[PDB]
CSV table of C-alpha atoms in Angstrom, one decimal:
chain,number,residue,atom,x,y,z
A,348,UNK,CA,-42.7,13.8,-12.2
A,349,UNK,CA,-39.6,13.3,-9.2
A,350,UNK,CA,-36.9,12.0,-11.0
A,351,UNK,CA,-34.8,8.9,-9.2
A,352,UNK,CA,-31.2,8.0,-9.6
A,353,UNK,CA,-28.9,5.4,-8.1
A,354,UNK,CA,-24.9,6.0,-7.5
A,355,UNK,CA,-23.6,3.2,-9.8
A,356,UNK,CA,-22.6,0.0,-7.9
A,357,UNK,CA,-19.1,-0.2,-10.1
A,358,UNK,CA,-16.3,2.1,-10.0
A,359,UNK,CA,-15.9,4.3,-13.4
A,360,UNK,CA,-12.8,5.9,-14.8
A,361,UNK,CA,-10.3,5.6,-17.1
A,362,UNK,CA,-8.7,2.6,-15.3
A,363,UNK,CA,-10.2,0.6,-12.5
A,364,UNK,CA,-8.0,-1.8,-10.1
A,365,UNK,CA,-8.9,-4.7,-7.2
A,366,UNK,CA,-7.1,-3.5,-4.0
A,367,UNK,CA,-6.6,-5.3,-0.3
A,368,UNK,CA,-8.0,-3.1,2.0
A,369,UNK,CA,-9.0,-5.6,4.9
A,370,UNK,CA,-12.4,-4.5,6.3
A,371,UNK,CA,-13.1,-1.4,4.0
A,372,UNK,CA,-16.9,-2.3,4.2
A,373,UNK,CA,-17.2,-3.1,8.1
A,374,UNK,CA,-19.9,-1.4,9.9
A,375,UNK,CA,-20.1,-3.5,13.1
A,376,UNK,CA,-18.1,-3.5,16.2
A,377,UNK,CA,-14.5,-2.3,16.4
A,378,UNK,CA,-12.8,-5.3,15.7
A,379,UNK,CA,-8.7,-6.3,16.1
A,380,UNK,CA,-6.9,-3.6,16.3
A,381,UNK,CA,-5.1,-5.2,13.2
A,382,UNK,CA,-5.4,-4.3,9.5
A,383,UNK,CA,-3.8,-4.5,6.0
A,384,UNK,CA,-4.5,-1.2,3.6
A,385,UNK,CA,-2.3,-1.8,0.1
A,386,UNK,CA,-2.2,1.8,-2.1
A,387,UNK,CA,-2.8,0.9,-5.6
A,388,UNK,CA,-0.7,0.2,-7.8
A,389,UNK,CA,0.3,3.6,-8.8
A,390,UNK,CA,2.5,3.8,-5.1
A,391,UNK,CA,5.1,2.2,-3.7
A,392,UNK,CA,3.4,-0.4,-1.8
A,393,UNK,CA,6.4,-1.3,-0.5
A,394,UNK,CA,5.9,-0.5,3.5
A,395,UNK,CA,4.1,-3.8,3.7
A,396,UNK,CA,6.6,-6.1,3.1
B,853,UNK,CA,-1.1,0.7,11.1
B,854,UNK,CA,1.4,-2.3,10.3
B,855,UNK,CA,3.4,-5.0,12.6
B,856,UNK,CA,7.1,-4.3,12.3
B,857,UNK,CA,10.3,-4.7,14.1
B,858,UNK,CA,13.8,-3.8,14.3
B,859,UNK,CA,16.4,-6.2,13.0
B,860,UNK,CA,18.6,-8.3,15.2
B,861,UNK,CA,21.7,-5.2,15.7
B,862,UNK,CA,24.2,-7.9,14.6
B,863,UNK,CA,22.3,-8.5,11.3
B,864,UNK,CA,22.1,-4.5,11.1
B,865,UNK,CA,25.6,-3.7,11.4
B,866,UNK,CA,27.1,-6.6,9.4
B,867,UNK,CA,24.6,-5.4,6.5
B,868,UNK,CA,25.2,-1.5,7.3
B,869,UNK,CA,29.0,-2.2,5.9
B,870,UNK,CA,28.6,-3.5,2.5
B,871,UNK,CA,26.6,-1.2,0.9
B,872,UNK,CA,28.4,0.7,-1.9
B,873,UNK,CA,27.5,4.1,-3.6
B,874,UNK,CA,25.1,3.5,-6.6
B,875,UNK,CA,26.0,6.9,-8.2
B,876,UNK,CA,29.7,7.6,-8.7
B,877,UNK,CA,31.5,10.2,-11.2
B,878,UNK,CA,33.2,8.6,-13.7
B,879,UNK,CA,34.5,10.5,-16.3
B,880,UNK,CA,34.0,7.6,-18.8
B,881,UNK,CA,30.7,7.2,-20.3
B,882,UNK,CA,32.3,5.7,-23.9
């Protein structure tokens, strides 16, 4: 009679997009106090360069 | 956070001089 549902593993919307965001999963320790975070697309991902 | 630094001054000021206006009134558009 309960009722399950999963969140969806894959992104939906209108338009999806592969980003670099370096260690946007990491659950460990800290780690180097050094990243890389691109916006999408949309932005001016300009700072990084 | 990113990894950046300030240009060599010489580079700076040499590059700081040549830059002209992009907009400018001209009263031709013909």
């Amino acid at each position: 009679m309960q009722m399950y549902q999963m969140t969806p593993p894959l992104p939906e919307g209108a338009v999806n997009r592969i980003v670099c965001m370096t260690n946007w999963a990491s659950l460990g320790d800290e780690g180097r106090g050094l990243e890389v975070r691109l916006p999408p697309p949309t932005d001016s991902s300009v700072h990084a360069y | 956070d990113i990894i950046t630094r300030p240009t060599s001054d010489s580079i700076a000021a040499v590059a700081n001089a040549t830059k002209p206006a992009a907009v400018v009134s001209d009263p031709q558009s013909m």
